[PDB]
Design a protein around this nucleic acid. Structure first.
Ligand SMILES: Cc1cn([C@H]2C[C@H](O)[C@@H](COP(=O)(O)NP(=O)(O)OP(=O)(O)O)O2)c(=O)[nH]c1=O
Ligand SMILES: [Mn+2]
Ligand SMILES: [Mn+2]
Ligand code: NA
Ligand code: NA
Length: 324
DNA sequence: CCGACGTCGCATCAGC
DNA sequence: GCTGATGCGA
DNA sequence: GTCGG
């Protein structure tokens, strides 16, 4: 919060670029700038000072100058009172409503949650779920609830077939005190690259049967996106509904998957950079050697996370030490 | 100057 | 009905 | 919007 006013500003600008102007690369630019400023251990005195940071250029330096001198940005203040733009930006907070749908809604006079509630038949299945759990989906999940959620998922998975391997990844696996969602990775010895596709279905079905999974956003043969909720403790207040994903991955690509979806974002980029250095290319699925001309060879056998590290001469890093 | 900038599974649309 | 495009989330 | 080939 050292430069909180600046990073709040850049984040708000980022959102209007994505949701209103539909300029995804400007969105990412503003977030890159906000992130590098968020890490900078001094209170910024000038735009010139900030411009030394990678990701902060001429225009943002100009904006920072205006903010420091006046306490605001004229453009941002203006788009804030724009009823059309502020409404488009807001509606995209509904899961399933992106920039395109939000624009169409506002175009025909639908600008609020209240308006969405009045117009169910113009909402697809995902958008209806996003509306129903609008509040819940914006809450974070305390680690304690995540632990209880993990208890349920690992138990039910093993109950379906004890040969399943399941891992809760993401921020939880890195040991975070709270999480945005629950990322579950699943594999099974009978599922390889060279291979039934009811393997995901039976796990989803069992979680529905014990009433853990409450809604489905999408479900194919390899990826489930949905909603879950912990059971209510006696006559206590109900737990918020939570977002849960389940990914079914071939055995031979499982740990490349666990690595990637454990993160963090930044650790992943660093690791992949070091791999090219050492002559390897790592994606979410595999690790392949690069020839002298840059030609990628066959995927290398991986039977653990650590295997990936050994391939690239890196010593195993604990998930709790993967913030970068 | 001017193109890159993460990527891909699933739901649903657009065209035929 | 089928194929490819588009929107969306993360 | 920022970067860099
Ligand atoms: C979206 C995204 C995902 N990942 C792979 C690694 C992210 O850390 C990770 C898990 O994704 P997540 O749930 O979007 N992020 P998180 O679990 O670290 O954070 P949170 O608990 O959802 O807030 O998956 C990336 O490497 N880059 C990304 O941009
Ligand atoms: Mn997550
Ligand atoms: Mn996630
Ligand atoms: Na800079
Ligand atoms: Na949305």
């Amino acid at each position: 919060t050292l430069n909180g006013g600046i990073t709040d500003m850049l984040t708000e600008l980022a959102n209007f670029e994505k949701n209103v102007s539909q300029a995804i690369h400007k969105y990412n630019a503003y977030r890159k700038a906000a992130s590098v400023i968020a890490k900078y251990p001094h209170k910024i005195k000038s735009g010139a000072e900030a411009k030394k940071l990678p990701g902060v250029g001429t225009k943002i330096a100009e904006k920072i100058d205006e903010f420091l001198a006046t306490g605001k940005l004229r453009k941002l203040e203006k788009i804030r009172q724009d009823d059309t733009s502020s409404s488009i930006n807001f509606l995209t907070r509904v899961s399933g409503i992106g920039p395109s749908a939000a624009r169409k809604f506002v175009d025909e006079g639908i600008k609020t949650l209240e308006d969405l509630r009045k117009n169910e038949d113009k909402l697809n299945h995902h958008q209806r779920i996003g509306l129903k759990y609008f509040g819940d989906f914006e809450k974070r999940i305390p680690r304690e609830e995540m632990l209880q959620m993990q208890d349920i998922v690992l138990n039910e998975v093993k109950k379906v077939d004890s040969e399943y391997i399941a891992t809760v990844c993401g921020s939880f696996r890195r040991g975070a005190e709270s999480s945005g969602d629950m990322d579950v990775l699943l594999t099974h010895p009978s599922f390889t690259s060279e291979s039934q596709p009811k393997l995901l279905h039976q796990v989803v079905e069992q979680l529905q049967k014990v009433h853990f999974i409450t809604d489905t956003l999408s479900k194919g043969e390899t990826k489930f996106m949905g909603v879950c909720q912990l059971p209510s403790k006696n006559d206590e207040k109900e737990y918020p509904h939570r977002r849960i994903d389940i990914r079914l991955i071939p055995k031979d690509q499982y740990y490349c998957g666990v690595l990637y979806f454990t993160g963090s974002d930044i650790f992943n980029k660093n690791m992949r950079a070091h791999a090219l250095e050492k002559g390897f290319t790592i994606n979410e699925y595999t690790i392949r050697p690069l020839g002298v001309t840059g030609v990628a060879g066959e995927p290398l056998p991986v039977d653990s996370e650590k295997d990936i590290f050994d391939y690239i001469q890196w010593k195993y890093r604990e998930p709790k030490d993967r913030s970068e």
